[PDB]
Design a protein around this ligand. Structure first.
Ligand SMILES: Nc1ncnc2c1ncn2[C@@H]1O[C@H](COP(=O)(O)OP(=O)(O)OP(=O)(O)O)[C@@H](O)[C@H]1O
Ligand SMILES: Nc1ncnc2c1ncn2[C@@H]1O[C@H](COP(=O)(O)OP(=O)(O)O)[C@@H](O)[C@H]1O
Ligand SMILES: O=[P-]([O-])[O-]
Ligand SMILES: [Mg+2]
Ligand SMILES: [Mg+2]
Lengths: 572, 587
């Protein structure tokens, strides 16, 4: 419950709306209890008066009471559901902004120890589960407490002992039953989320290794232990339905004890008179209708356990420290930058094998370097040292013979222009996908770069306004790569880092991109990381990587002259 | 929209036959639940009348108290019982659908599983089968409690008063009518905001994903205002949708509180001499008003719970949308057989007019003709996409072939897969380690092996030369989430696992494709001394120093065009000259 505190701070903003939504959940819930309590007394008072005393009985007052109490629970529930959800949606915006802002400083580093495909889908669900602490846990538990109170003080005028033993029974269950069920199911909720991720881990490895499991005759041995995990998993699910069934059955044996008690106890006199008459109904029907206040409460033990898990899961992800530390010196961006590296070493967190054994690399200004390697040599790990995703444990990285760690982030992002290996297509419009490169560019300025990189087909049928993202037009793999270059061109920076810019492309579009990179980026330093061998003659130096090492270095012609790994690349 | 949704619901009803015994006890206990609701409402009404009208003391009503407590205890037992049977009904359907999905995925094989990412299948099996629970556990048992219980109240009140039973029954045709008038208005707001709402739902995950791109452009601070201005739009658009969604719900709470208001007023005035109508001539009774008043809120409770459980129908048909198409795809797969190979000697492979067909039905390899006698090792060379790996999947049994492909003279499709695979062993292009530890992967072919022959496997493959690097030695839990092995290190484990058992055919598939210099020469050396012991079919890109392999096959669009010794193909002009002389080596 202490990990639920950082997000209760977010709830302090928009406290008014949240308080008003709770208040309407009390007026509605008191009208519901008051409609049945007054109806039960009105029926009992009319029956005791009988046909005699038609004019003697003041039936108009309850009749307008049962009409007002009925309207304010139909209308109150309407605005309770509006203010509660509207206030929830405002907190959701603060939760989304808080989570995003606490994840940017560690966006490539703090999230690299997880599987990023399923981590961020879990983060979005964790924020949605945190956003519903108010609707599922806070609004019922706090709305039930101040209805049990108003009913207790409300009925204390007629008889103290009845109101104190109805309010006492209702208070006891409110304060004691959610904790005893959150405690009883605490182990299962831990077991449920552990067996769920184990079944996902065993199933994914069963599907991926299906070719290997089938041949080696383990596809059935590894399915039996997969189906035994599901049996364990379904058993944990079954035990949560034994606490949802028990809490639903216990709340019915408590709302039954408070009706048997207000029948037996309120028949021995309500206050002074030994024969209360109509007052018995007002206490039996109150105890009958007052346990709908606790109906939302009987499930709030299951929802509190989930919200707590999300609070812990989000926190320990965003409460860890960024790998890099950006100074505030506020330097000025250079016009031309030279890249220098000396013995850069880097072991990924929680690993025992070095990703970068040692890198020596000099890239003068206006020089086009290419880095060659196979899968997993460590080349895209080198580019993330230059953008300061990580810090090399041993080694020094220089920009214009000044350490790269001495640049404030706003200046580093203006010195480095990078096209990633995995180009990300944002959901927003085509103009917005380019305006992140340079916000100040104009529509014509965006258009010239877009048609210059060969993406002129995106300039038709409201092309610059087409949605072009998820829930919209999806760009092809070849077109997506041209989009990445269009951002690198718009975001003019002295040094341009490329990460497999021609991966998975036919030679027709591979040549078009390669010729586009040599002519547009002629005056800008380029460090292109390549898995292919096409069009490497225009590069002043080719650096061949192998298992985190620079095994070969030199110009294209020089590399062919001396027999080595680069020679083995063309001729196997 | 209405065409598919009708077809999906019949699919859900088809699956409910699994655990139909428990979907009946849920329906039977729902009727008994509505009887105990009436019994306790009658017991309370008769207790309360005696102590309010004729002032009978509580100590003379011990029998109704005793029966009222028992009714309350029985009610709690039924609610406890009904939840457990509802879950039991839900999980048999999930347990059986998950077996049909996993049986379909296992029989389809790696040829079809590779079509989608392992997280796309894991959503089908985990997320979308678990989405169907609350349809069978809550919504279906509630759609039967919503029609049985409210009719029991009307049937139990009609004998005592026909207007009290008409107040409740008068809102039975009013709620669906009014809920549909607001439905016409809702469809106006829902459809206008449908495009944008689905457009803004995936916004936060889209900024969260690809947060690297925002970092490398320095736009992390200007996208806070994008999240702020896409959450203001989402909230405003969805609240105008929700003004009509909570109004449709409010119809039930309007008639819930009007039905308790009219019952209170009609009975209240009936006791005061007014409103003499509505009751049979015998007379008016206080216990006949308590019984109707206690049961009026319980008339709509089954219809109010159903409002909360209705979302379980939408997420069970969306689950059924992607589960029906999964089970309805034709997925033609290789024919299983019963004959088996007794001999463990190297096999002879000959194919006449052999065609490899994709699981969907298209052909991946054309009319292949080749013959590979026992003990002879062949090598497959060709351009990318030439059907090189489709031939290796057919020999593995993963793909269906229409032509002829014989193993020792016995047709492959007439060979029992569970025995053919014991004579089969290969190393793929990518190391797929599906076992927990590094020793469990090596021993995956035969787990009951002693250390002597385990230690021999590691040394023969040079898996033991990087063991000191690993933290726990040979028992390290391996993976991308624990003790990452480089592609060179994981490929040597895949070689060690493949060479653990003697085999008849070794289908090495581009093993040294993406490896560093050291592991490439350690994997290739081990598999050059392993290809000799049995007939071997390799596919490779590095066609230099390929002379010692006996017969070389060259593939073109799915046809073996040229064959023979390396010397004969190398010197002679032909397609092998084109592959070798044009040493482009694009990667
Ligand atoms: N499971 C599948 N379902 C449908 N089509 C497929 C499947 N597997 C391959 N194909 C298609 O059939 C053709 C068969 O080519 P194949 O994958 O055998 O080439 P390859 O020899 O593996 O080339 P490379 O080794 O360079 O990938 C390919 O063009 C591919 O697109
Ligand atoms: N997040 C990570 N945590 C630990 N190890 C990683 C991570 N990402 C990559 N590696 C390892 O580092 C090596 C080099 O990674 P990378 O530079 O991404 O490959 P490439 O150089 O082919 O782009 C790979 O063998 C990989 O196993
Ligand atoms: O591992 P991939 O980035 O070459
Ligand atoms: Mg990379
Ligand atoms: Mg292949």
């Amino acid at each position: 419950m202490r990990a639920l505190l950082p997000y209760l701070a977010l709830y302090k903003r928009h406290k008014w709306m949240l308080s008003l939504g709770i208040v309407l959940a009390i007026v509605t819930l008191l009208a519901s209890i008051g409609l049945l309590t007054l109806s039960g007394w009105f029926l009992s008072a009319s029956a005791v008066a009988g046909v005699a005393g038609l004019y003697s009985f003041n039936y108009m007052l309850p009749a307008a009471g049962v009409r007002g109490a009925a309207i304010t629970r139909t209308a109150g529930r309407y605005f309770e559901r509006l203010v509660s959800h509207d206030a929830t949606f405002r907190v959701l915006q603060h939760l989304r902004i808080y989570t995003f802002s606490k994840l940017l400083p560690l966006s490539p580093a703090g999230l690299a120890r997880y599987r990023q495909g399923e981590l961020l889908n879990r983060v979005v669900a964790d924020v949605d589960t945190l956003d519903h602490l108010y609707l599922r846990v806070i609004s019922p538990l706090v709305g039930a407490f101040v209805v049990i109170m108003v009913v207790t003080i409300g009925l204390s005028f007629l008889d103290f002992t009845l109101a104190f033993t109805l309010g006492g029974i209702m208070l006891l269950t409110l304060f004691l039953m959610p904790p005893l069920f959150y405690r009883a199911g605490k182990s299962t909720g831990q077991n449920l989320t552990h067996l769920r991720g184990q079944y996902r881990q065993q199933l994914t490895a069963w599907l991926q290794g299906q070719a290997e499991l089938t041949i080696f005759g383990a596809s059935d041995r590894y399915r039996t232990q997969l189906e035994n995990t599901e049996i364990q998993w379904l058993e944990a699910q079954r035990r949560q339905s034994e606490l949802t069934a028990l809490s639903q059955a216990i709340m019915l044996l408590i709302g039954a004890l408070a009706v048997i008690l207000m029948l037996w106890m309120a028949s021995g006199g309500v206050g002074g008179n030994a024969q209360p008459g109509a007052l018995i109904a007002l206490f039996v029907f109150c105890a009958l209708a007052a346990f709908e206040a606790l109906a939302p409460v009987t499930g709030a033990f299951q929802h509190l356990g989930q919200v707590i898990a999300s609070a812990v899961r989000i926190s320990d992800l965003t409460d860890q420290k960024p790998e890099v530390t950006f100074p505030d010196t506020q330097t000025r961006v250079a016009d031309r930058v030279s890249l220098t590296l000396r013995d850069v070493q880097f072991t990924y967190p929680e690993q025992s094998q070095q990703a970068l054994k040692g890198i020596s690399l000099q890239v003068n200004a206006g020089e086009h370097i290419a880095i060659l390697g196979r899968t997993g040599c460590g080349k895209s790990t080198l580019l993330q040292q230059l953008t300061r995703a990580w810090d090399p444990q041993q080694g020094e990285i220089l920009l214009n013979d000044s350490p790269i760690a001495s640049l404030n982030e706003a200046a580093l992002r203006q010195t480095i222009s990078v096209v990633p290996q995995r180009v990300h297509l944002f959901s927003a419009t085509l103009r917005d996908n380019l305006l992140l490169a340079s916000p100040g560019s104009s529509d014509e300025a965006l258009s010239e770069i877009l048609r210059r990189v060969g993406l002129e087909k995106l300039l038709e049928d409201a092309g610059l306004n087409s949605w072009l993202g998820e829930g919209g037009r999806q760009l092809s793999g070849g077109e997506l790569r041209r989009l990445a270059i269009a951002r690198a061109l718009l975001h003019d920076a002295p040094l341009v880092l490329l990460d497999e810019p021609t991966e998975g492309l036919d030679a027709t579009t591979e040549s078009q991109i390669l010729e586009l990179l040599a002519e547009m980026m002629r005056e800008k330093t380029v460090l292109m990381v390549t898995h292919r061998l096409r069009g490497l003659s225009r590069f002043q130096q080719i650096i061949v990587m192998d298992n985190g090492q620079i095994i070969e270095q030199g110009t294209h012609a020089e590399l062919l002259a001396r027999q080595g790994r680069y020679y083995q690349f063309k001729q196997g | 929209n209405k065409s598919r949704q009708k077809e999906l619901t019949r699919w859900l009803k088809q699956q409910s036959v699994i655990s139909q015994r428990w979907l009946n006890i849920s329906r039977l206990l729902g009727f008994v639940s509505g009887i105990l609701i009436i019994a306790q409402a009658w017991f309370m009404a008769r207790i309360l009348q005696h102590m309010i009208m004729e002032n009978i003391p509580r100590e003379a009503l011990l029998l109704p108290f005793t029966l009222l407590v028992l009714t309350f205890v029985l009610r709690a037992w039924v609610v406890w019982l009904r939840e457990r049977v509802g879950y039991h009904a839900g999980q048999h359907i999930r347990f059986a659908i998950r077996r049909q999905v996993l049986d379909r995925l296992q029989q389809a094989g790696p040829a079809w599983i590779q079509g989608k990412p392992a997280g796309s299948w894991a959503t089908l099996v985990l997320e979308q089968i678990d989405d169907m629970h609350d349809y069978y556990a809550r919504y279906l048992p509630q759609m039967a409690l919503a029609v049985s219980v409210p009719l029991l109240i009307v049937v139990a009140i009609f004998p005592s008063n026909w207007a009290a039973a008409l107040i409740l029954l008068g809102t039975a045709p009013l709620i669906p009518l009014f809920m549909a008038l607001v439905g016409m208005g809702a469809a106006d707001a829902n459809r206008r905001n449908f495009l944008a709402l689905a457009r803004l739902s995936g916004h936060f995950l889209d900024r969260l994903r690809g947060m690297e791109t925002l970092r490398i452009f320095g736009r992390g601070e200007a996208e806070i205002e994008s999240i702020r201005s896409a959450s203001e739009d989402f909230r405003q658009r969805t609240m105008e949708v929700l003004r009509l969604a909570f109004l449709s719900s409010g119809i039930l709470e309007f008639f819930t509180s009007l039905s308790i208001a009219l019952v209170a007023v009609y009975f209240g005035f009936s006791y005061l001499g007014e409103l003499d109508f509505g009751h049979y001539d015998t007379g008016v009774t206080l216990a006949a008003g308590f019984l109707a008043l206690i049961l009026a809120p319980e008339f709509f409770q089954p219809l109010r719970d159903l409002g909360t459980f209705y979302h379980a129908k939408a997420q069970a048909v969306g689950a059924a949308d992607s589960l029906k198409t999964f089970m309805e795809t034709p997925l033609a797969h290789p024919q299983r057989g019963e004959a088996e190979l007794a001999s463990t000697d190297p096999v002879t492979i000959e194919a006449e007019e052999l065609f490899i067909t994709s699981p969907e039905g298209k052909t991946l390899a054309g009319p292949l003709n080749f013959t590979l006698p026992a003990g002879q090792r062949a090598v497959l060379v060709g351009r990318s996409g030439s059907g090189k790996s489709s031939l290796l999947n057919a020999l593995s049994g993963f793909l269906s072939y229409q032509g002829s492909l014989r193993i020792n003279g016995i047709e492959l499709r007439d060979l029992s897969p569970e025995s053919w695979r014991k004579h089969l062993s290969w190393v793929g292009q990518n190391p797929q380690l599906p076992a927990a530890t590094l020793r469990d992967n090596v021993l995956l072919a035969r787990p009951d092996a002693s250390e002597q022959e385990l230690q021999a496997a590691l040394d023969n493959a040079w898996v033991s030369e990087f063991l000191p690097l690993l933290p726990q030695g040979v028992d390290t839990p391996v993976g991308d989430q624990a003790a990452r092995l480089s592609v060179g290190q994981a490929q040597r484990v895949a070689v060690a696992r493949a060479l653990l058992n003697p085999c008849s055919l070794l289908l090495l598939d581009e093993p040294a494709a993406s490896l560093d210099a050291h592991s490439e020469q350690r994997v290739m050396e081990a598999l050059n001394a392993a290809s000799l012991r049995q007939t071997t079919l390799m596919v490779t890109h590095q066609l230099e120093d390929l002379a010692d392999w006996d017969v070389i096959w060259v593939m073109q669009d799915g046809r073996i065009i040229e064959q023979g010794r390396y010397a004969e193909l190398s010197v002679a002009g032909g397609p092998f000259a084109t592959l070798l002389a044009h040493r482009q080596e694009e990667i």
